[PDB]
Amino acid sequence: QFAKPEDAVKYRQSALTLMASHFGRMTPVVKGQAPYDAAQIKANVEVLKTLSALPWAAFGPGTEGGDARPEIWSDAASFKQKQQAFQDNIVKLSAAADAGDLDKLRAAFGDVGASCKACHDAYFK
């Protein structure tokens, strides 16, 4: 869906920006600094679900650019493992949110954040 590589870069950056707002805006809730409304969080995690599936298709072959370390395309199976592990940790966060189980939410949130950081460490310039 991208006319030039720059379009893929702009798309993924925008997806990651959201996806990151929808994750990070829950930090006060997970820390207890903001109240926990199970329905609010269930709805927000559903948005995060959808967003978390979007960036990866915008790292097609030859869409090198942005802050994407070059190691992303030449090690394709390994980058895919990281996105799919991230994506699997998001399933666990959805399960916690859907259940209204705060303790499960906090644990799952930490796992998700570790998965963000793991990819950032291997693949962000």
Task: Give me the residues that bind ligand HEC (CB under 6 A), please.
Answer: 9, 12-13, 16-17, 19-20, 23, 66-68, 72, 82-83, 86, 112, 115-116, 119-120, 123-124
Contacts with 115 (C-beta within 8 Å, 6 or more apart), sequence order: 82, 85, 86, 89
- Which helix (DSSP H) or strand (DSSP E) does residue 38 occupy? helix 38-52
Within 47-66, which residues bind a copy of itself (CB under 8 A)? Answer: 47, 50, 54
Work out whether 18 is an interface residue with a copy of itself (CB under 8 A). Answer: yes
- The annotated binding site is made up of 12-13, 67, 116, 119-120
d(CA 88, CA 95): 11
In degrees, rounded to 5, the angle at the alpha carbon of residue 72 between the alpha carbons of residues 66 and 76 is: 145
Q: How many CB atoms lie within 10 A of CB 58?
A: 22
Of the pair 21, 34, the CB lying nearest ligand HEC is at 21
Q: Which residues bind a copy of itself (CB under 8 A)?
A: 1, 10-11, 13-15, 17-18, 21, 24-25, 47, 50, 54
